[PDB]
Design a protein around this ligand. Structure first.
Ligand SMILES: O[C@]1(c2ccc(-c3ccccc3)cc2)CN2CCC1CC2
Length: 284
């Protein structure tokens, strides 16, 4: 085990802990590709959690300066300000892959903004947020998951990211509400006559279910479009990306099965993930 192995194993630990689904799928990649995914994923996770370290932007600005160091001097030795292990691994990735740094910076700006969170007026703003927080992650992963990147590769990977985020939102309505977040748009909440606080207090009803299903059908159509364009990705990543996605699409059924509850986080059992992999592994 080298020092660099240790940095990657740490990145792996961050990804497994926070997402058993993506870990389950992406750990099936060939060794150099999965390690690159762990490092990008861990960086993104550190960005998402940065504000809560002290309670302000300090740690986030240090991550950003780390990433800028890597971009400007990819082969120089850096004394990293934030998480050294993760930044050494990201730097190692960047020496082998064309990383879209502006995509990390977009993610970072979305985090800064999310400090003065106000609800989205319209769905267009919600979809902007899904880009910021998750389409950006798809962009950064693109060179890892595909042999030759075109605008279409980025477009697909970006749409996949945003569709996964929409599914997250639909899974976490109640938990987000507790943390003073609602991600459904004001336009759409008014249209369907739905008040999240009221639903959190009194349970689901037909209006909420219609609103929830409105968004679920968006996520599902987007997912179908990604699946139909799966060939943009490397041959080894295709089944894995299909699995990651299918596991996530299954979250929607878990929600309906639990009657759209706002008081627990539903999940797709590990044994179910393995069933979907069998279904897919056959096709490939
Ligand atoms: O977990 C994030 C994420 C979302 C989407 C993809 C993705 C994965 C594969 C392809 C495209 C995107 C990765 C990570 C990272 N972070 C901000 C948003 C969510 C929650 C915390």
């Amino acid at each position: 085990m080298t020092m660099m192995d240790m940095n990657f194993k740490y990145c792996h630990k961050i990804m497994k802990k926070h997402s058993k689904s993506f870990s389950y799928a992406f750990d099936l990649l060939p060794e150099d590709q999965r390690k690159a995914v762990w490092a990008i994923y861990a960086v993104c996770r550190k960005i998402d959690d940065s504000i809560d370290v002290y309670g302000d932007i300090q740690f986030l600005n240090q991550i950003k300066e780390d990433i800028q160091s890597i971009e400007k001097y990819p082969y120089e030795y850096h004394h990293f300000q934030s998480d050294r292990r993760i930044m050494m691994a990201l730097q190692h990735v960047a020496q082998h892959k064309n990383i879209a740094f502006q995509s990390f910076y977009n993610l970072i700006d979305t985090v800064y903004k999310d400090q003065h969170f106000t609800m989205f007026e319209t769905d267009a703003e919600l979809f902007g947020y899904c880009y910021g927080v998750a389409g950006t992650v798809g962009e950064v992963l693109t060179p890892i998951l595909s042999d030759h990147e075109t605008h279409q590769t980025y477009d697909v990977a970006r749409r996949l990211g945003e569709s996964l985020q929409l599914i997250n939102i639909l899974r976490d309505v109640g938990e987000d509400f507790e943390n003073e977040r609602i991600y459904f748009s004001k336009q759409r909440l008014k249209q369907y006559e739905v008040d999240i606080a009221e639903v959190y207090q009194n349970g689901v009803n037909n209006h909420y279910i219609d609103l929830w299903e409105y968004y679920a059908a968006i996520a599902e159509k987007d997912f179908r479009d990604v699946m139909d364009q799966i060939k943009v990705f490397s041959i080894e990543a295709q089944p894995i990306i299909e699995l990651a996605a299918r596991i996530y699409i299954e979250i929607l059924d878990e929600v309906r099965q639990a009657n759209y509850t706002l008081h627990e986080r539903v999940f797709v059992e590990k044994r179910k993930k393995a069933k979907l992999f069998h279904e897919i592994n056959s096709k490939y």
